[PDB]
Amino acid sequence: SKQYINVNGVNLHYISKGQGELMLFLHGFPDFSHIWRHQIDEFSNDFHTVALDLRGYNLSEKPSGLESYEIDVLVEDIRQVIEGLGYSSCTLVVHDWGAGIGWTFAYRYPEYVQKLIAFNGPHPYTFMRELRTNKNQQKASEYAKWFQKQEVQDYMERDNFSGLRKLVIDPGVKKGYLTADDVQAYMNSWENGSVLSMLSYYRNLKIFTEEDLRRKSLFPLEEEVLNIPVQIIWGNQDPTFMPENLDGIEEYVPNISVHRLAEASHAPQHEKPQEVNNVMWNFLNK
- Please tell me the distance from the alpha carbon of residue 114 to that of residue 139, in angstroms, as a whole number: 35
* Angle (nearest 5°) at CA 175 between 171 and 178: 75
Q: Which residues are catalytic?
A: 96, 202, 266
Specify the resolution in Å: 1.7
Residue 104 in contact with residue 212, Cβ under 8 Å? no
Asked if 215 and 206 touch (Cβ cutoff 8 Å), the reply is yes
- The answer to whether 51 and 33 are in contact (CB under 8 A) is yes
> At 231, phi and psi to the nearest 5?
-120, 125
CA nearest 115: which of 259, 216, 232?
232
What angle (nearest 5°) sits at the alpha carbon of residue 253, between those of residues 251 and 254? Answer: 75
Q: What is the rounded distance in angstroms from the CA atom of residue 216 to the CA atom of residue 133?
A: 13
- Sheet of 48-52: strand order equals 2-7, 10-18, 48-52, 22-26, 90-94, 113-119, 230-235, 256-261
CA distance 269 to 125: 23
Number of other CB atoms surrounding residue 255 within 10 Å: 12
Instruction: Give the span between the Cα atoms of 20 and 141, in whole angstroms.
Output: 39
The domain that holds 46 is classified in CATH as 3.40.50.1820
Rg (alpha carbons) of the chain, rounded to whole number = 17
Among left, alpha and beta (phi > 0; psi -120 to 50; other), residue 96 is: left
- Structural domain count, the chain: 1
Using CB atoms within 10 Å of the CB of residue 19, give its burial: 0 to 12 exposed, 13 to 18 middle, 19+ buried.
exposed
Per the entry, the structure determination technique was: X-ray
Query: Can you state the angle between helices 71-84 and 97-108, rounded to 10 degrees?
Result: 70
Q: Domain range spanning residue 89?
A: 1-286
Beta pairing, strands 90-94 & 256-261:
unpaired
